[PDB]
Symmetry: D4
Subunit: 181 residues, 8 copies
Amino acid sequence: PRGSHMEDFVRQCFNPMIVELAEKAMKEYGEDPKIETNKFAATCTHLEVCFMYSDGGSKHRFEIIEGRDRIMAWTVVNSICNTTGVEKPKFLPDLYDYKENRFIEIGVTRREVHIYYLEKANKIKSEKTHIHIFSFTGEEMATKADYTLDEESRARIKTRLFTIRQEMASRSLWDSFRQSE
Amino acid sequence: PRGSHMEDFVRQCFNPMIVELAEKAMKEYGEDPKIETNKFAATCTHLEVCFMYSDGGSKHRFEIIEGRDRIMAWTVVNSICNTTGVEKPKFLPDLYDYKENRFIEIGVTRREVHIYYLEKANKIKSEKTHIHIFSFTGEEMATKADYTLDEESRARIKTRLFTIRQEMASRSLWDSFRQSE
Amino acid sequence: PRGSHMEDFVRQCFNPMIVELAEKAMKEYGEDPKIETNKFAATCTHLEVCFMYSDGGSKHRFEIIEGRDRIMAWTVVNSICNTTGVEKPKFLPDLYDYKENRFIEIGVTRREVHIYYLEKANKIKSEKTHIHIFSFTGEEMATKADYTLDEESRARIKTRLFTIRQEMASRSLWDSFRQSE
Amino acid sequence: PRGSHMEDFVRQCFNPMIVELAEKAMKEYGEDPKIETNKFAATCTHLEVCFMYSDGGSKHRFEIIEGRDRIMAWTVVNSICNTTGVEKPKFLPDLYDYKENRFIEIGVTRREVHIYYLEKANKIKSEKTHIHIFSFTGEEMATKADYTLDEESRARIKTRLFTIRQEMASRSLWDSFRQSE
Amino acid sequence: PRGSHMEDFVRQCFNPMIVELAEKAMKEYGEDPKIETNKFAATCTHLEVCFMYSDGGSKHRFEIIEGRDRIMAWTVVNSICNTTGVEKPKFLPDLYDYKENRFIEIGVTRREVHIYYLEKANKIKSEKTHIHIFSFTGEEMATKADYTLDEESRARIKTRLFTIRQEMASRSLWDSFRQSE
Amino acid sequence: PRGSHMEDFVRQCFNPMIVELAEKAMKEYGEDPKIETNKFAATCTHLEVCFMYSDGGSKHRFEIIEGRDRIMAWTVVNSICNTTGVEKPKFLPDLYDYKENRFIEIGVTRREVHIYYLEKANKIKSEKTHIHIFSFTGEEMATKADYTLDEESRARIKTRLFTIRQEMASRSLWDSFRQSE
Amino acid sequence: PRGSHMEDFVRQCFNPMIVELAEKAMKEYGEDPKIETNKFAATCTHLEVCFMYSDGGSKHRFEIIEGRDRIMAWTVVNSICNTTGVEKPKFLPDLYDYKENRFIEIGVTRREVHIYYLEKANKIKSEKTHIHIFSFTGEEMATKADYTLDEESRARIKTRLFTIRQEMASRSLWDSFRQSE
Amino acid sequence: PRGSHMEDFVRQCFNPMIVELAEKAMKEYGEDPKIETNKFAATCTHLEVCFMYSDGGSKHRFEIIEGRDRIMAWTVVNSICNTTGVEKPKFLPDLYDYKENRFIEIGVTRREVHIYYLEKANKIKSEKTHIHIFSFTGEEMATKADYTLDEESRARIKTRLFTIRQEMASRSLWDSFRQSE
Ligand SMILES: COc1cc(CCNC(=O)c2[nH]c(-c3c(F)cccc3F)nc(=O)c2O)ccn1
Ligand SMILES: COc1cc(CCNC(=O)c2[nH]c(-c3c(F)cccc3F)nc(=O)c2O)ccn1
Ligand SMILES: COc1cc(CCNC(=O)c2[nH]c(-c3c(F)cccc3F)nc(=O)c2O)ccn1
Ligand SMILES: COc1cc(CCNC(=O)c2[nH]c(-c3c(F)cccc3F)nc(=O)c2O)ccn1
Ligand SMILES: COc1cc(CCNC(=O)c2[nH]c(-c3c(F)cccc3F)nc(=O)c2O)ccn1
Ligand SMILES: COc1cc(CCNC(=O)c2[nH]c(-c3c(F)cccc3F)nc(=O)c2O)ccn1
Ligand SMILES: COc1cc(CCNC(=O)c2[nH]c(-c3c(F)cccc3F)nc(=O)c2O)ccn1
Ligand SMILES: [Mn+2]
Ligand SMILES: [Mn+2]
Ligand SMILES: [Mn+2]
Ligand SMILES: [Mn+2]
Ligand SMILES: [Mn+2]
Ligand SMILES: [Mn+2]
Ligand SMILES: [Mn+2]
Ligand SMILES: [Mn+2]
């Protein structure tokens, strides 16, 4: 344990509440944020994107599933299913859209949004669950070209993603981060 | 007094301000939250629903009548009546709709929304007061099919209701809660 | 000094910030809130109405002139005039409407809105300044029937006014308050 | 160092966070707020205008570039460029408009908005960057007559500017401030 | 209900947390603070004195028994008894002195401290429980002349008591308050 | 009104709560802080010294009389008198010492502490009231050479006084301040 | 997972910060607070006692070792050792006493303090580390009869311990808690 | 600029207020915290030690000179001198001891406390100014062996110093930090 300068960057780069939430998620899965630090930065990035995503749109539009502990998120998923009638997904998604009546799986990738979306779409058999991918280069890929949010909201997410990339490269940790996924 | 694990659940499940407001309501009616704990959970659930309800819509759209002490709520009801011209209801309602110019009676039930609405509609002789029922299973029933709020707002209330049900069943207190109303 | 139970009511009835602002206004005009307590309650009521009024509408829609000290309010009035081109009013108004490009004089009365509006309209030679009157009975009177705000926003002001009236009558201070203006 | 009453005015006139941000900006450029106090008041005024500007419009509409340190602002500019495709400006702007897809250069002047806009438009070779000028007299000048914001929002900025002018003249520091730019 | 100007004084005179605690105490005993207002002022006064009392002395010196609900205070009393060995009192006291190893019964009276102490000492058969009386005139009477606290601390309590008396007399509610105990 | 740079200094120099308290004191006595600015700085300085004074010593040692409005301070003085037995002073003092059982009159002077103490001792016929003088040069003069407080506490007051003097001289307002008392 | 009413009690009984710290400790050791709930209550109780313990005595007297993550606590232990000269303990203790120059191992037991102290003293070969045991019945056992703290401070810990016991028995979870250690 | 992982450590290691104060100090002296990062960590360490130092002892015992801007610290030094009579030091010290009537120069070193004290004692011609040195290894050296503070307070400073050393070595930045002074 200890020694990784990715850890000090992650702590100085991200909101402290997001960092505590990423630590719980990895510790729930038997991973050490001080050891697997590239996944520590990835879990923080994925968490923040999900939060800025639900921040886009109306006030009660989304239900945040990511960031809850495994049991609570599954409890909320059931309540959404058993009241809207939508089918229970096989894997925990990140958001639910009360406006569009679908769960959203949000992906952040260090490669082509084409490959990651292929990978994630091959995982969920429920083609009903919406998929929305973002990349650190500025691209995005969504189901049926339905990007759910306003252009301005998704622009904010892509900008924040590129800033995190620049700050990693400035600290010479980006190359290890990209060649880690 | 003391001993009920419904009490510890109610305290861990609901917002602490809602719990203090439910305690005042029952104590105003000569009921002990530590003894009649199923009504303690019911008064909390009814309180929260009324609060998420007024949270739906515009900022000045509703006037919260529930949660006030008996004298203050009746004082506010008079002021609404003596300025809008609407008729003074026989029983204290939960909300007033400045947008639709009617008081709202909000009901949460552990049975069919059909029976509860029948019961509540038979209580208020003023057919002018709007009735909106929710259930722990996900159904809702409103006057003239006028559901007052957006689909997304009512979806949030139904989801929260089903989560409270799951958490009660997980603690094996749901069966006593349903067969108590 | 001391002894008036209107003073304890005013302090328990109104927001503490509004009470401090009313005290400064009267003390600026050589009046004692502990002695002239009916005007103390009136200045609080007028202050709150002006605040709920600017709270109606959009975020940057109004400029609050009431509640500022005499020099600062006149400084803001000049800045509004010397940038919008509107004529400098002879008497300090309460609000300025950036949406309608006019100053608003807000009146709260214990008699007919017809008489008070006549009185206030006879004071301002600038017929450009908008006048909006409210009463403790629920009536309102505005210039050119232009009520500036939504129906729901003005309904909130009339309700709050009637609650203050009920609370005064319950404390038997209303009759002295009405027969004091 | 010390002695300037422009400094005490700037501290009493502006928000303390804006004052700390102006001090960092000048100290980054080798200027002393206690010595060059007219620029200290100017940097505060420019900062506040940029902040009320981004406050106009929608919640995620703008990206604040002014107020960041030189490296961070340039990092954010790159992220905006490398994700929107817009060209990297030669000089750091103040805002980016996600709604209009352009950087905004905001100018505050003590002379004609005609001269200052001429000066600033001659500096940026990128005619793509939008320019919006304000003056202490109440005028404004924008690119292609596209004023970006609502009439009410820009009216607030012009009023605040004229209040700062009045407060300087009342302290007899305005004449030195105008004949300093 | 409603109408008593003792109620508005009690709310303006006492800390709002103390007022909420007095309301719970009376409502636990089937008393209405809006009806029995002299006892409402008395319960507030007794509560504050107990709080300034525990505020005297060292940080962990006292255990506050007053202000807790009946079940919780009795739970704490047992824990003090079953760990210190002191005898369980027949009636709930107000404080426990970890420094002197005794429960303290704190009395506030509107008559002679001689009579009230006689009354309270005749109620507790446990002569082990310390008694400390205060009056609105400035006198105090304690067991074995052991006044537990510093002279300066008890002086603060007597001063606060006399201020409450003056404020009641100024509002002409003192005579009803004294001839009510 | 307006124009004095002593006003901007007073606002930037003193705690904002002390400034609000000084404004109320002068406005209670028919004085304008924007006009009589040397007294505005003096009332702030006297207020702060009284506050750092009560901050010296134990927690319940002093009762702050300065800073209260005239009626409330006299109410507290009576309560101190009618419970300690000390004689009611002819003029309102600043503090009461529960440890030494005497009221304290605190003076801040711009001349010799010898002259000011002579002046203040000639005003109070009650030789029982303790007098403690401070100067902007670093001297102090107290009754019976009883300086009430620790050496370190009074050293802090003298240092703060000399800093206020330096800041005034740096702004060239000290000479007017000294030749104003 | 889920179902244990010990969990709802632990959450309603203990400070929320202590509950988060207990969850991290168990999750660091591969234990689930929702499954092993008796240890969840035990870790909370041990945590609180350590905190009230360091709260006793002077402000800088102790260094809290418990509650830190394993790496940070060991880092602090080294710093204490490499600056005071004390020997590095084989097992992580809970506190360090700057006043007595020794680490403290704090134990809370559901049996005789005699047995637990025997067990813990047999674990640490460093007889230099001080041991202080508390029980839920009110007993305590310390090294060389040196109880480190004042009588009043340890009395508070024993009382709090007995209250937790009563609240568990009232919820019928005490018998499982005692027969679990 | 940018790239140093000492910067991310300094931000994650130290209190954010101390980091802002260190940045102002270096920027006042024409140094970049992002470039000269070893001095950035040193200025933070020196700042924290000075703060824990003044935290030792009584409440009004010290006057913090470090952390103020150059003009303000010199203003406070004059006020201390012109009221206590102590001689004005040639170089700005860190603290003033109201209890011992001397300025304190606090040094933190990465070598022998013997050499650094020799260096610092050779700089101040005023042998009246007290010198107190700390090292990252746990040693300390003070004037006349007068260590000013309690043993426990200085023990806390030495421990914190050794923790900062361990955290630097764990990040492999300690060797560059020690061989930089
Ligand atoms: C190593 O496995 C884990 C999983 C979790 C929770 C997973 N739940 C999700 O929902 C999830 N995870 C990821 C993801 C990532 F952010 C980084 C690396 C690999 C990933 F799959 N991307 C998503 O988009 C997503 O929705 C926590 C810790 N470790
Ligand atoms: C036992 O009687 C009471 C009544 C009150 C206030 C009643 N005022 C309402 O307004 C109210 N009550 C209820 C309700 C409930 F939430 C639980 C059980 C039975 C109910 F009728 N449902 C509503 O929908 C409603 O509007 C408080 C305590 N006890
Ligand atoms: C002396 O030079 C500086 C520059 C900076 C940052 C410049 N960056 C801008 O972006 C900037 N500056 C100015 C501006 C001003 F506010 C006052 C005087 C002269 C100016 F050019 N007006 C703008 O409109 C603007 O966008 C900080 C300190 N000193
Ligand atoms: C009407 O009876 C009640 C009792 C309680 C709680 C009693 N528990 C005490 O501990 C208590 N009560 C009183 C007291 C008083 F403050 C006012 C009137 C009469 C009193 F006896 N003086 C004390 O000194 C005291 O210790 C609450 C409401 N009503
Ligand atoms: C112009 O008269 C006033 C009086 C008050 C309240 C007086 N009450 C005191 O207690 C008081 N006043 C003064 C004092 C001063 F601070 C400045 C100038 C002259 C003074 F006498 N020095 C004290 O030491 C003192 O105790 C408020 C406004 N204006
Ligand atoms: C199952 O093992 C663990 C250990 C830890 C951290 C141990 N570190 C200590 O320091 C520690 N633990 C315990 C303790 C307890 F509180 C409950 C059960 C058994 C125990 F030994 N009593 C102490 O007194 C103590 O000092 C966290 C989670 N699980
Ligand atoms: C490069 O020069 C500077 C100086 C300052 C303020 C100096 N004023 C002091 O008071 C000061 N400085 C230092 C110190 C240090 F912390 C790191 C390196 C060298 C040092 F001398 N040690 C002290 O002990 C001390 O009292 C700020 C920035 N850069
Ligand atoms: Mn995802
Ligand atoms: Mn209802
Ligand atoms: Mn008006
Ligand atoms: Mn600009
Ligand atoms: Mn009592
Ligand atoms: Mn005085
Ligand atoms: Mn232990
Ligand atoms: Mn130093």
